[PDB]
Design a protein around this ligand. Structure first.
Ligand SMILES: O=C(O)CNC(=O)Cc1ccc(O)c([N+](=O)[O-])c1
Length: 236
């Protein structure tokens, strides 16, 4: 039913200031439904992510009014009503499928005409490990009440899309792993230091990627705020 759940987005779109942009997000399992509790996020160069929409239709505080999300027919839709040059980015949707998140493949939006944050998630820039070893990645949540939010982990392999790893609730300790990562990743947290940790084990060159933390919580704007991403390189 859902073991091959795949989320599809437009490959690319081109716009210019003042145009309206429609980005869509389709589920292989059927219509996108309210239970899929869709988030939309934006990636700008050097893998800088910002959450835009959560819960299908909720615009995150601070996000420009020109962004809006809805479920229309059988798809999730992000509309930019009056594009701006700073909107040039890759846009990803994310759907909740019972017990894990699935990201779409992303839409590259080009905008013709080219040319601090209270909440911070703090990740190291880079790590390097040898194959067969394990490595610790950290993410310190700054400027918000850390136990009140889950910490999601996500990866982007070089040149490719986003993959959800899992999440941890610091308050209850509850962990979810994606089936893709349940033997690769181990999540822990420490409340007094407001730090989430992810151990990646049995490393291979396939694990060379950027690894992000991002906030969530039940009914919240999942993936609203992101760490910068730690680049892990696995090499002898
Ligand atoms: O349907 C609603 O009203 C709110 N839905 C959500 O927030 C989506 C959700 C639900 C449970 C859960 O454990 C996770 N997760 O990320 O682990 C995410």
């Amino acid at each position: 039913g859902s073991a091959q759940a795949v989320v599809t987005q437009e490959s690319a779109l081109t716009t210019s200031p003042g145009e309206t942009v429609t980005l869509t997000c389709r589920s292989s399992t059927g219509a996108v439904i309210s239970s899929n509790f869709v988030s939309w996020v934006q990636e700008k160069p050097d893998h800088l992510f910002t959450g835009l929409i959560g819960g299908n239709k909720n615009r995150a505080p601070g996000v420009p009014a020109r962004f809006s999300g809805s479920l229309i027919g059988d798809k999730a839709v992000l509309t930019i009503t009056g594009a701006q040059t700073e909107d040039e980015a890759i846009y990803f949707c994310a759907l909740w499928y019972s017990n894990h998140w699935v990201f779409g493949g992303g839409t590259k939006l080009t905008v013709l005409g080219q040319g601090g944050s209270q909440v911070q998630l703090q990740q190291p820039g880079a790590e390097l490990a040898k194959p067969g070893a394990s490595v610790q990645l950290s993410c310190k949540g700054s400027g918000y009440t850390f136990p009140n939010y889950w910490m999601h982990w996500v990866t982007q392999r070089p040149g490719r899309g986003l993959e959800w790893i899992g999440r941890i609730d610091p308050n209850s300790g509850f962990i979810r792993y994606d089936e893709r990562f349940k033997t690769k990743a181990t999540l822990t947290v420490d409340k007094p230091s407001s730090t989430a940790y992810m151990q990646l084990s049995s490393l291979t060159s396939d694990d060379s990627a950027v690894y992000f933390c991002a906030r969530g919580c039940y009914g919240c704007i999942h993936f609203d705020y992101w760490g910068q991403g730690t680049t892990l390189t696995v090499s002898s």
